[PDB]
């Protein structure tokens, strides 16, 4: 009368804490390094083009150019002004592109799931996963032909420590408490009911692994078991089973409007650039001292 | 003999196809993808189900949108970028004239001042006279508006682009008019839709009945071609089993999306009063529990198949690096020319 | 000098991030604020829980 | 006289903007640490320069 299978449940993804160097999120790690290499090239070329501008003086000019502050260093050669003007256009686009992409992040926030499929948590091998101590799903895992669940049973058996709980109620409790550290495996039917019930902190992910079903049982011989089997098949066609499952699962539930509000920026997410500042200040004192120390001798 | 699945005529009870051959008894048993119905259960005895099916959605696969190598000049149109260059020349020439008149602003220096203003990189020398100051002030006012308009428009471009959702569930289909959806002309799919007592699938069929062109397609394979021709403008509803196989075999421009809607199962049939029901029904359960079907289904679908972070990418900026290299190329040539001269 | 330059460069890198973060956050603040609809019709009541 | 069932909500009060409702994007503890850093930067610069 209804079909089911074994599925994966995890704790809701929620929102992360930005630690340090979280302000480099808008751009890829590939682009940042390209800017570093490029600015060396422009500085070196400026020197070779010229032959005042040395190695030290040229490097400073292209640093002051990227930060977009006006100094008193200006290439007087025609060749150098082709270099300078081209490097300026690069600066203008990079800064403007940064500002735009950062605005998009703080307008709409997307919380994306870490795992997608059963083959995903086969490779990740980070978050713990198991079943009941002894049950139907536990017996399925033990005897498997295909390699993917055979590798999974290897993990399940030789687990440190054993990832097995007594009750299914204990399994749900372990998922919420662990906070993205334990993933429980059970029937898809119960999983969908637990998600709709209070206070909503877990959800279904991926497809089902096996395919089983429930039915109406009747004693051996079954003199009265014939007609009721046919009637259910007709009520399946009419769509009464789907109507009834929609009433208890979905209709009667805790969590059903999404209203987003932009919050003020806290110090924790900008903290990264503060450490860089004071760190650079302390370094400047060190170099100035030894420059005087060996000049004295 | 017939080539049909199994259907009885309303007048004469002449069963055609697979079940028709079983009724009088030309064959012992049958193994074919055949659904179970109340109508079918009376005349022929069905066994326990082996493979479960459902109605799912098939759309054209979103092609890998490779960003344009110059997809960073999209915010401003081409005719604007043209007029910025023209104005830049006209500004320098006028500045040059009014500066020196019977001055540091030569023909070379006045040209250098104008670029420094637009790029926003300060200045070396400021205009001294009144005539030079007034033309400098307007060029400053021009710059501040063009730059800020470019930043705001690009901000709007990326904001809209990331807050878009593909047609995931049947609810998304229910609230869309631009992307059409239709089934076969006749079958078990459309028959279910008529006596559908659901939430918003009654509204789904309400729209299906009245369409501008004929949404219902006669052929299933020709219906798959209509989705290809539309290119993300039509969706075709069918069985899940057939949908998954169509993605694998044949050129890849399709995919399955969302969960299953309807519940229906295939089975193995032999006419009632057969003694073959006993060992076969239990054998089906013996295959499923141990995992014979699941390995076999993996082979013919996938093994015998011919298919298969959201920051700012490098490709979006890639273009502006080509401008940087080309500039340094000319720079070396200028050094080459004026060395041979002197 | 070298000692004076290195402290200047970090103060430049500090400035560029603080300013751009302020502009983008204010852009997000006004974007959200204007795309809000009051409870107008009975349909709006039908799809609200708060 | 014709009648009908309608909706009654609390009237949205005239949201007079704060006289300092332009310092909302950044929190108060950030604005504090920008001032502290500004002093520390100047003093260090002054020392190593001369
Ligand atoms: N080829 S098809 O597009 O998918 C397809 C289209 C239409 C009806 C089908 C059908 C398939 N099928 O999966 O081969 C099996 C099947 N079985 C039944 O018993 C029945 O009544 N109708 C069908």
UniProtKB/Swiss-Prot annotation, chain A:
Induction: Down-regulated in the pyramidal cell layer of CA1 in the hippocampus by global ischemia. Residues 53-68, 69-71 dip into the membrane without crossing it. A lipid is attached at residues 71, 293 (S-palmitoyl cysteine). It comes from the Eukaryota. The chain crosses the membrane at residues 29-49, 78-98, 270-290. The modification Phosphoserine is found at residues 144, 178. Residues 72-77 are cytoplasmic. Disulfide bonds join 200-255. Detected in forebrain. Detected in dendrites of neuronal cells. Expressed in the pyramidal cell layers of CA1 and CA3 and in the granule cell layer of the dentate gyrus. It is found in: Cell membrane; Postsynaptic cell membrane; Postsynaptic density membrane. Ionotropic glutamate receptor that functions as a ligand-gated cation channel, gated by L-glutamate and glutamatergic agonists such as alpha-amino-3-hydroxy-5-methyl-4-isoxazolepropionic acid (AMPA), quisqualic acid, and kainic acid. L-glutamate acts as an excitatory neurotransmitter at many synapses in the central nervous system and plays an important role in fast excitatory synaptic transmission. The M4 transmembrane segment mediates tetramerization and is required for cell surface expression. Belongs to the glutamate-gated ion channel (TC 1.A.10.1) family. GRIA2 subfamily. Homotetramer or heterotetramer of pore-forming glutamate receptor subunits. Tetramers may be formed by the dimerization of dimers. May interact with MPP4. Forms a ternary complex with GRIP1 and CSPG4. Interacts with ATAD1 in an ATP-dependent manner. ATAD1-catalyzed ATP hydrolysis disrupts binding to ATAD1 and to GRIP1 and leads to AMPAR complex disassembly. Interacts with GRIP2. Interacts with GRIP1. Interacts with NSF via its C-terminus. Interacts with CACNG2, PICK1 and GRIP2. Interacts with GRIA1 and SYNDIG1. Part of a complex containing GRIA2, NSF and NAPA and/or NAPB. The postsynaptic actions of L-glutamate are mediated by a variety of receptors that are named according to their selective agonists. This receptor binds AMPA (quisqualate) > L-glutamate > kainate. This is Glutamate receptor 2. It comes from Rattus norvegicus. The gene is Gria2.
From Swiss-Prot, chain C:
Detected in cerebellum (at protein level). Changing residue 37 to A: No effect on phosphorylation by CaMK2. The modification Phosphoserine is found at residue 37. The chain crosses the membrane at residues 2-22. It is found in: Cell membrane; Endoplasmic reticulum membrane; Postsynaptic cell membrane; Postsynaptic density membrane. Phosphorylated at Ser-37. Palmitoylated. Depalmitoylated by CPT1C and upon L-glutamate stimulation. The M4 transmembrane segment mediates tetramerization and is required for cell surface expression. The postsynaptic actions of L-glutamate are mediated by a variety of receptors that are named according to their selective agonists. This receptor binds AMPA (quisqualate) > L-glutamate > kainate. Ionotropic glutamate receptor that functions as a ligand-gated cation channel, gated by L-glutamate and glutamatergic agonists such as alpha-amino-3-hydroxy-5-methyl-4-isoxazolepropionic acid (AMPA), quisqualic acid, and kainic acid. L-glutamate acts as an excitatory neurotransmitter at many synapses in the central nervous system. Homotetramer or heterotetramer of pore-forming glutamate receptor subunits; heteromeric assembly can be the result of both receptor subtype and flip-flop forms and according the composition, one partner can be dominant with respect to the fast desensitizing current component, whereas the other can determine the steady-state component. Tetramers may be formed by the dimerization of dimers. Found in a complex with GRIA2, GRIA3, GRIA4, CNIH2, CNIH3, CACNG2, CACNG3, CACNG4, CACNG5, CACNG7 and CACNG8. Interacts with HIP1 and RASGRF2. Interacts with SYNDIG1 and GRIA2. Belongs to the glutamate-gated ion channel (TC 1.A.10.1) family. GRIA1 subfamily. This is Glutamate receptor 1. It comes from Rattus norvegicus (Rat).
């Amino acid at each position: 009368f209804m079909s089911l299978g074994i599925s994966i449940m995890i704790k809701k993804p929620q929102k992360s804490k930005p630690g340090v160097f979280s302000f480099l999120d808008p751009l890829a790690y590939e682009i940042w390094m390209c800017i570093v290499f490029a600015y060396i090239g422009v500085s070196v070329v400026l020197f070779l083009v010229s032959r005042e501008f040395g190695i030290f003086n040229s490097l400073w000019f292209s640093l002051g150019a990227f930060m977009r502050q006006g100094c008193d260093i200006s290439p007087r050669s025609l060749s150098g002004r082709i270099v300078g003007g081209v490097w300026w256009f690069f600066t203008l686009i990079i800064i403007s592109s940064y500002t735009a992409n950062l605005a998009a992040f703080l307008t709409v926030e997307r919380m994306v799931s870490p795992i997608e499929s059963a083959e995903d948590l086969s490779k990740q091998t980070e978050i713990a996963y198991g079943t009941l101590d002894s049950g139907s799903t536990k017996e399925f895992f033990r005897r498997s032909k295909i390699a993917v669940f055979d590798k999974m049973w290897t993990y399940m058996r030789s687990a440190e420590p054993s990832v097995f709980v007594r009750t299914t109620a204990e399994g749900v409790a372990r998922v919420r408490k662990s906070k993205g550290k334990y993933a429980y495996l059970l029937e898809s039917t119960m999983n969908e009911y637990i998600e709709q019930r209070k206070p909503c902190d877990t959800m279904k992910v991926g497809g089902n692994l096996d395919s089983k079903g429930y039915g109406i049982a009747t004693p051996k011989g079954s003199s009265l078991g014939t007609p009721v089997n046919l009637a259910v098949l007709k009520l399946s066609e009419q769509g009464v089973l789907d109507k009834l499952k929609n009433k208890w699962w979905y209709d009667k539930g805790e969590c059903g409007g999404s209203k987003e509000k932009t919050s003020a920026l806290s110090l924790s997410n900008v903290a990264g650039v503060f450490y860089i500042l004071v760190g650079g200040l302390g370094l400047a004192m060190l170099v100035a001292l030894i420059e005087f120390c060996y000049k004295s001798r | 003999s017939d080539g049909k699945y199994g259907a009885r005529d309303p007048d004469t009870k002449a069963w055609n196809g697979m079940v028709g051959e079983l009724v009088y008894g030309r064959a012992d048993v049958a193994v074919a993808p055949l659904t179970i119905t109340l109508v079918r259960e009376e005349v022929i005895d069905f066994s326990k189900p082996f493979m479960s099916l459902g109605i799912s959605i098939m759309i054209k696969k979103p092609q890998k949108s490779k960003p344009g190598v110059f997809s960073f000049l999209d915010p401003l149109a081409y005719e604007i970028w043209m007029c910025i260059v023209f104005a830049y020349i006209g500004v320098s020439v006028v500045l040059f004239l009014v500066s020196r008149f019977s001055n540091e602003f030569g023909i070379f220096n006045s040209l250098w001042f104008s670029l420094g203003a637009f790029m926003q990189q300060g200045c070396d020398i400021s205009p001294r006279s009144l005539s030079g100051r007034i033309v400098g002030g307007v060029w400053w006012f021009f710059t501040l508006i063009i730059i800020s308009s470019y930043t705001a428009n690009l901000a709007a471009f990326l904001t809209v682009e990331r807050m878009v959702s593909p047609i995931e569930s049947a609810e998304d289909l229910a609230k869309q008019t631009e992307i059409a959806y239709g089934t076969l002309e006749a079958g078990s799919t459309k028959e279910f839709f008529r006596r559908s007592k659901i939430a918003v699938f009654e509204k789904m069929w309400t729209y299906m009945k009245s369409a501008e062109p004929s949404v219902f397609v006669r052929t299933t394979e020709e219906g798959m071609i209509r989705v290809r021709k539309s290119k993300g403008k039509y969706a075709y509803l069918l069985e899940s089993t057939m949908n998954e196989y169509i993605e694998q075999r044949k050129p890849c421009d399709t995919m399955k999306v969302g969960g299953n809607l309807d519940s229906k199962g295939y089975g193995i049939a032999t006419p009632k009063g057969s003694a073959l029901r006993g060992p076969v029904n239990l054998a089906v359960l013996k295959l499923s529990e141990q995992g014979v079907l699941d390995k076999l289904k993996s082979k013919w679908w996938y093994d015998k198949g011919e298919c298969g972070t959201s920051a700012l990418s490098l490709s979006n900026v890639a273009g502006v690096f080509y401008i940087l290299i080309g500039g340094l190329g000319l720079a070396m040539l200028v050094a080459l020319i004026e060395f041979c001269y002197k």
